[PDB]
Amino acid sequence: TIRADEISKIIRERIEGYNREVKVVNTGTVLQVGDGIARIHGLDEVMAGELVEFEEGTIGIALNLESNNVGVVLMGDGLMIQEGSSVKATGRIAQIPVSEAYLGRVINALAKPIDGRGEITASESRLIESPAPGIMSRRSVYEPLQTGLIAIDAMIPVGRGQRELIIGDRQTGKTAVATDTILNQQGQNVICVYVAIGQKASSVAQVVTNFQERGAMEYTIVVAETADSPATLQYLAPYTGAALAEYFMYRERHTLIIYDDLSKQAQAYRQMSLLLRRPPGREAYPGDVFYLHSRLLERAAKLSSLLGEGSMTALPIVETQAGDVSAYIPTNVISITDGQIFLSADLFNAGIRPAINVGISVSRVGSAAQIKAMKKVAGKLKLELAQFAELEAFAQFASDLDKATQNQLARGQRLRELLKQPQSAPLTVEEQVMTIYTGTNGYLDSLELDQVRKYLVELRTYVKTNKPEFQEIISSTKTFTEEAEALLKEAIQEQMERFLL
Amino acid sequence: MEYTIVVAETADSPATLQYLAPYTGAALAEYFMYRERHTLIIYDDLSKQAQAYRQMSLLLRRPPGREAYPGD
Amino acid sequence: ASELAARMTAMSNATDNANELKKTLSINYNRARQAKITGEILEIVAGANAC
Amino acid sequence: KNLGRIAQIIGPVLDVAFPPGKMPNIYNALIVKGRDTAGQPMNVTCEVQQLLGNNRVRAVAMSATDGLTRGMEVIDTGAPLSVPVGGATLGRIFNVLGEPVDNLGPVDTRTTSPIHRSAPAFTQLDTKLSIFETGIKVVDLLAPYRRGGKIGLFGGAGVGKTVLIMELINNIAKAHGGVSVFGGVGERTREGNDLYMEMKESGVINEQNIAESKVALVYGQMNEPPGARMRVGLTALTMAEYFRDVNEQDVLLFIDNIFRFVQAGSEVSALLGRMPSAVGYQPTLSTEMGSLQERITSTKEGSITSIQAVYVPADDLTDPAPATTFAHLDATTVLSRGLAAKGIYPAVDPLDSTSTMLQPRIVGEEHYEIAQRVKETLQRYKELQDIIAILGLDELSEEDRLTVARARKIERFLSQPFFVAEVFTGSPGKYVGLAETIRGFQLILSGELDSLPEQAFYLVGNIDEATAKAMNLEMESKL
Amino acid sequence: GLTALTMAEYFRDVNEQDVLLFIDNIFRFVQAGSEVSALLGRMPSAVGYQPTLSTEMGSLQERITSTKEGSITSIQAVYVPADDLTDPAPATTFAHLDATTVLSRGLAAKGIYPAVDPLDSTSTMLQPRIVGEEHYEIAQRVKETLQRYKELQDIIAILGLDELSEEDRLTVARARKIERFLSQPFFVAEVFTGSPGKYVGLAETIRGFQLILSGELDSLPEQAFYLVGNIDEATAKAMNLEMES
Numbered sequence A: 001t002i003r004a005d006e007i008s009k010i011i012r013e014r015i016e017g018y019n020r021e022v023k024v025v026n027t028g029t030v031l032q033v034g035d036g037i038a039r040i041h042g043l044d045e046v047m048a049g050e051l052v053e054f055e056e057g058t059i060g061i062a063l064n065l066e067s068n069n070v071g072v073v074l075m076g077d078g079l080m081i082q083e084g085s086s087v088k089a090t091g092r093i094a095q096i097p098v099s100e101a102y103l104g105r106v107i108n109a110l111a112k113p114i115d116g117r118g119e120i121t122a123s124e125s126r127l128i129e130s131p132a133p134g135i136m137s138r139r140s141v142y143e144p145l146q147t148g149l150i151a152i153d154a155m156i157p158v159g160r161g162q163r164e165l166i167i168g169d170r171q172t173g174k175t176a177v178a179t180d181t182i183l184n185q186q187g188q189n190v191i192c193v194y195v196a197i198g199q200k201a202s203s204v205a206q207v208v209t210n211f212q213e214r215g216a217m218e219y220t221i222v223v224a225e226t227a228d229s230p231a232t233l234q235y236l237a238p239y240t241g242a243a244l245a246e247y248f249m250y251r252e253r254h255t256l257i258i259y260d261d262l263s264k265q266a267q268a269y270r271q272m273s274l275l276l277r278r279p280p281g282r283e284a285y286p287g288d289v290f291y292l293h294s295r296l297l298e299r300a301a302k303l304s305s306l307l308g309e310g311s312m313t314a315l316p317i318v319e320t321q322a323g324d325v326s327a328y329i330p331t332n333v334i335s336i337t338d339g340q341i342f343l344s345a346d347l348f349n350a351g352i353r354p355a356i357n358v359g360i361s362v363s364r365v366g367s368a369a370q371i372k373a374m375k376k377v378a379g380k381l382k383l384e385l386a387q388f389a390e391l392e393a394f395a396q397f398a399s400d401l402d403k404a405t406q407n408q409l410a411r412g413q414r415l416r417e418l419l420k421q422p423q424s425a426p427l428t429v430e431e432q433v434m435t436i437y438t439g440t441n442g443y444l445d446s447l448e449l450d451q452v453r454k455y456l457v458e459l460r461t462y463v464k465t466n467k468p469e470f471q472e473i474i475s476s477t478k479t480f481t482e483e484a485e486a487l488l489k490e491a492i493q494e495q496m497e498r499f500l501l
Numbered sequence B: 001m002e003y004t005i006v007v008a009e010t011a012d013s014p015a016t017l018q019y020l021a022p023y024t025g026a027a028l029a030e031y032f033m034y035r036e037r038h039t040l041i042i043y044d045d046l047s048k049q050a051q052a053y054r055q056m057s058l059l060l061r062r063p064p065g066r067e068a069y070p071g072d
Numbered sequence C: 001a002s003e004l005a006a007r008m009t010a011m012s013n014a015t016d017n018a019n020e021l022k023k024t025l026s027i028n029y030n031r032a033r034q035a036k037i038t039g040e041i042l043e044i045v046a047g048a049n050a051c
Numbered sequence D: 001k002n003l004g005r006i007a008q009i010i011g012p013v014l015d016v017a018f019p020p021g022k023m024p025n026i027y028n029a030l031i032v033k034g035r036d037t038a039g040q041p042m043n044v045t046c047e048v049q050q051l052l053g054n055n056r057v058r059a060v061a062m063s064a065t066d067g068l069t070r071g072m073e074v075i076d077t078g079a080p081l082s083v084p085v086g087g088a089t090l091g092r093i094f095n096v097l098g099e100p101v102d103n104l105g106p107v108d109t110r111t112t113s114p115i116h117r118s119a120p121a122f123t124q125l126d127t128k129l130s131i132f133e134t135g136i137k138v139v140d141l142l143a144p145y146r147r148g149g150k151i152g153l154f155g156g157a158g159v160g161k162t163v164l165i166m167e168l169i170n171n172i173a174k175a176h177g178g179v180s181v182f183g184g185v186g187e188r189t190r191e192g193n194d195l196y197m198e199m200k201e202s203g204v205i206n207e208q209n210i211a212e213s214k215v216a217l218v219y220g221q222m223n224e225p226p227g228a229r230m231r232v233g234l235t236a237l238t239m240a241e242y243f244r245d246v247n248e249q250d251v252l253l254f255i256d257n258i259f260r261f262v263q264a265g266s267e268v269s270a271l272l273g274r275m276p277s278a279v280g281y282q283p284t285l286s287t288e289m290g291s292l293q294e295r296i297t298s299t300k301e302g303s304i305t306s307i308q309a310v311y312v313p314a315d316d317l318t319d320p321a322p323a324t325t326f327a328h329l330d331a332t333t334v335l336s337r338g339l340a341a342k343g344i345y346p347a348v349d350p351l352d353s354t355s356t357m358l359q360p361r362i363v364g365e366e367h368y369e370i371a372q373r374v375k376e377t378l379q380r381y382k383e384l385q386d387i388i389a390i391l392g393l394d395e396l397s398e399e400d401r402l403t404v405a406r407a408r409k410i411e412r413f414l415s416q417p418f419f420v421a422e423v424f425t426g427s428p429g430k431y432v433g434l435a436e437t438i439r440g441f442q443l444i445l446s447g448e449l450d451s452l453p454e455q456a457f458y459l460v461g462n463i464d465e466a467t468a469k470a471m472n473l474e475m476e477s478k479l
Numbered sequence E: 001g002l003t004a005l006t007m008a009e010y011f012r013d014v015n016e017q018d019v020l021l022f023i024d025n026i027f028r029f030v031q032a033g034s035e036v037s038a039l040l041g042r043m044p045s046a047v048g049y050q051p052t053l054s055t056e057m058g059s060l061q062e063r064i065t066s067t068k069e070g071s072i073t074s075i076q077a078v079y080v081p082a083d084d085l086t087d088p089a090p091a092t093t094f095a096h097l098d099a100t101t102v103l104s105r106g107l108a109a110k111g112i113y114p115a116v117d118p119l120d121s122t123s124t125m126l127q128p129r130i131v132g133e134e135h136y137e138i139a140q141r142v143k144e145t146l147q148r149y150k151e152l153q154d155i156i157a158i159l160g161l162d163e164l165s166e167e168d169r170l171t172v173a174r175a176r177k178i179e180r181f182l183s184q185p186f187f188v189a190e191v192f193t194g195s196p197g198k199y200v201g202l203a204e205t206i207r208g209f210q211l212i213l214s215g216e217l218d219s220l221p222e223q224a225f226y227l228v229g230n231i232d233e234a235t236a237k238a239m240n241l242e243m244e245s
């Protein structure tokens, strides 16, 4: 790849086609530096929201403009801003240039790529705080968004346009749920965006590696701000992800946004408002934290027919310490979000991966978006799993040697056996309905509980290769047809004869 | 008492001398320790000394910290 | 022997329940202590900012 | 270069007026030339924490401010806190700002580094989730460590914390190019000198030819002023990341412990007049934690791994200091007083040691199933301690006797004669590689070494050494 | 809140109409003032809220009274924050109401939906001059037995039920039947559970609870009463679940 022959003319292409404009710009003088605030003695007609640029490169945003100074906020470590030096009010009010060129490229909070691949070509501009869709710009959700997990996509479904909070403790598998959801969208026109607030760099680097190797970078964006980054970049980056998602949402395209996590944005805003000296509220959070989360989370919806059937699905994350749901940030986000997916750390530590809590988990619009086939096959799964969670309690004394309780132990341990899954190995809806239906009919009660996962992957691969009809019937009818039931029964009986013999 | 020195500054004293007194005890024990001689010292109590110092700080408008004790 | 075995079993159940109650009491106690410490610090800095 | 006067001091924080335009950037060193009690010229170093305005900046003092009157000459260096790096730092004990306190002599090697430096970029950072191989059998099997990862300590006194530190140091510095930067913030001086002379007599600091040692030591003393026990961790961190960046060693970092760093951060911020966070920690808790932790990674040059003790306030993991420390930790190694009282060292607790590395698709399916079965055997025995070892004894079951016997074998086999326990307790040292740990515990489990005495695996290295010890004890049995 | 209030106030004043009002949820209307008062520079009151808190409450609530000209009945949700009932905003909401019905988290997590806390729900209209003697009597004895089980709940949770007297397990069993019969499937929440909505009268709720407290129904099990409407739905539920063997 030689470039010396073309550089001799692309050095001259930069000169030609240039306007040499003149513009009266505002300009102030920096006075105080500290706690992420810079009071600027200037800026007579500055807009509260200007992208105030600093003479040492750092971009800032004008907030506290009283009468004799404008207290801007620094997007980044305003370290080398030399005192007295000028600022320049860029005229634009806190925008993000957006295009399709981000698809694959990682990105900071301030839209600046850190991929080391190139620059992002974006002529269109979206506001970082665009107004959320009102009451007429919306439409109740019916298209599913399948996360690839049996339990989630079975009994707590997620619509296209429904917030599902992934609430759970530290190291309980929430990142695994989010990556499984993103990897399941390898075919569907769901332009995912994964924003990662305040995480370790090795985690996001490993996830970026997973996203590239699993053939998934073609439709995702990674908005990354680590714990090294300032409080303001972390506080801002969810809104950057929301602007990036709303660009594709308004152009009739379904998208997916995953904040990771909203609790880190709450800590960043607590540091921000405490270094701003705002009298904070419930255990030192600022009183504005509910607004902080709502003014981004209520931007996720299903856009109307007149608006174009776009969608934004938000999968926020809230870490809970000591398992308490009553704490301030999770009880706020639950009041904002539609449903929650609790990830029980005692299940996860016992060895139930993923550790979806079957009972607390809620979906408001779950059964609407859950398809007819999954509905008809997952009703009985829900009934039997609920009764197993009840029968496991006090299982020993009263109901020890009953026919129903021995059968339900072999159908309630085995149901849980077929719920568990390997991380980064999603099941499309066909394998989901098949592996649910065999536990619904009960064709594994006689099997050993240790051979169950192998039996399920063998059933999956047999119906994959040797049954090229079931996928087509489940895709076409979108209903568990009795013809599909017949041919699947044929597959189940022959695979059982392979395995037991 | 043939060897024991007992420095003392009771509650009716200002916060200043209560804050000071353990340092005078420590200087006496330091001196006798630097004469190649083994020593001992009893502080009773550090809570009263900390309350005296906290009062001396809060009167000087030093910023209060956890349970009003200053950051020192 | 049957009643002593039933008694051992009932004590086992009571130890299980007492362990779990100890756990949830520790949880709520951590929350109570943290909220009380925070409330003290907030009232103290509020009074210091008042004067 | 800008000569500044001292305007205000309130304890360890200072108010340095400056010439009007030129002014030090935040986190710059300020040397305030002062005097002693008899007036001999001494210097107190400061670090700009805030640029207050009207040609005046605020600084926090790394040294004690007794000797600094109002209107003194404050010289700026223009760059942040510099410490020496290279071979001179190896083998010595350093203060907060890099003036060594071993009293053998001054430092050399005029290369240096700022105490505050950016994290490695997203492109440099290695994705390969390696394993930190160690000469210890239990932290190879039960709780594996990540290369570049963060490991926590929770064992108290008399359980063998410092011997485990020296064992990691010897194993990394024998098996590979190991360099150990022990940075102890909140280090009370007598325990620090105990640590120093323990390192001295255990052969890890060579005194006849210094700088050929394996360790570099920084001390954050208790009596040091507020910012000192914040910045000692960053001192040790930059001294370690030089070794990472230019010599491509596998650096081993020790922050004992992180709670004193968090507390000193809170106390600096509380003296700065900042509104505190929830429980009372500094408003900037998470970012202060991150800008210390996310400089400890693995790049394509080398890899700095840190093992940092933690103190948890009244064992409350819901507190912000532990719950934010674990947001960057990967594994934990909870030493037991129980395995110290039983008398098998190292005194770790296998049921209470967690690792994110112990997954099948990270370290192998064989290692995974071996660790899982070993955990299940010990979890059998721990409940069976009350059952048979106290009361029952009713010929428990042969399928349960087979677990009790091999749980005895495994509790004996978890120990290992350390290199630096030799002069201490009389145990000649052995390195046991990871594959040898897995194969040894494999054969302890698999029903091939049940017949030998249970003491044939106690204080032994590999498994072949265990069978040989069985033959030698049986020669003493036929004696 | 004031917009909806004057938009109902005109109807009630001029058209003389009985007006309904449904606000959801006024804790956000409190938090709005608590968020703007920290920006107006005013000194922060109790833990986070504004000093003018109860006056802020009254300036809505006192205008929502009925007159001789009309009527305003105002159902409202009052979100208690962090599952705390004694926070200043619900605490000052509790005074300007004619009935409180507090919604538990324990009864929600245990599945008896609606999760109304029975004996922490109170109304100013449970008086024998309004609802008559029989209704108030049955309600009083129901609350008595529920509190008896509530007092015994600690002793039950630590050890169990065998340690009790027979006269105590009679109340524990009656209240275990009541705690399930306090559920009722909703005409809205049928799309969640699957059990379609049931409207039950007061005059039959009283007779169902009288049949429970008499002891003419205590023989059939406790999960029979779960998620039904009338009392005959519970008795037919008991008769039905003894057919599917």
Ligand SMILES: Nc1ncnc2c1ncn2[C@@H]1O[C@H](COP(=O)(O)OP(=O)(O)OP(=O)(O)O)[C@@H](O)[C@H]1O
Residues within 6 Å of the ligand: A169, A170, A171, A172, A173, A174, A175, A176, A177, A203, A353, A354, A421, A422, A423, D327, D356, D359
């Ligand atoms: N279903 C699963 N199968 C196998 N491994 C899993 C599964 N779910 C989670 N894990 C493993 O558990 C570990 C922690 O999970 P994960 O990272 O998703 O949780 P987390 O909340 O992001 O943790 P942290 O926030 O500390 O990074 C990961 O190493 C992951 O590989």
Ligand SMILES: CC(C)C[C@@H]1NC(=O)[C@H](C)N(C)C(=O)CNC(=O)/C(=C\c2ccccc2)N(C)C1=O
Residues within 6 Å of the ligand: A048, A049, A061, A062, A063, A073, A094, A128, A129, A239, A272, A295
């Ligand atoms: C931060 C940017 C991207 C959007 C802001 N606006 C909002 O998000 C909404 C609409 N808010 C809070 C406002 O209307 C006021 N704006 C701000 O508070 C802010 C700034 C702010 C600073 C510190 C704490 C909180 C807020 N803006 C300048 C905005 O324009």
Ligand SMILES: Nc1ncnc2c1ncn2[C@@H]1O[C@H](COP(=O)(O)OP(=O)(O)O)[C@@H](O)[C@H]1O
Residues within 6 Å of the ligand: D155, D156, D157, D158, D159, D160, D161, D162, D163, D345, D346, D416, D417, D418, D421, D424, D425, D427
């Ligand atoms: N391999 C070993 N063999 C014998 N004793 C050991 C071994 N490892 C540790 N110990 C014992 O553990 C003690 C170390 O305790 P130490 O780590 O100094 O406690 P602290 O955490 O207070 O520093 C030593 O006194 C030693 O007797």
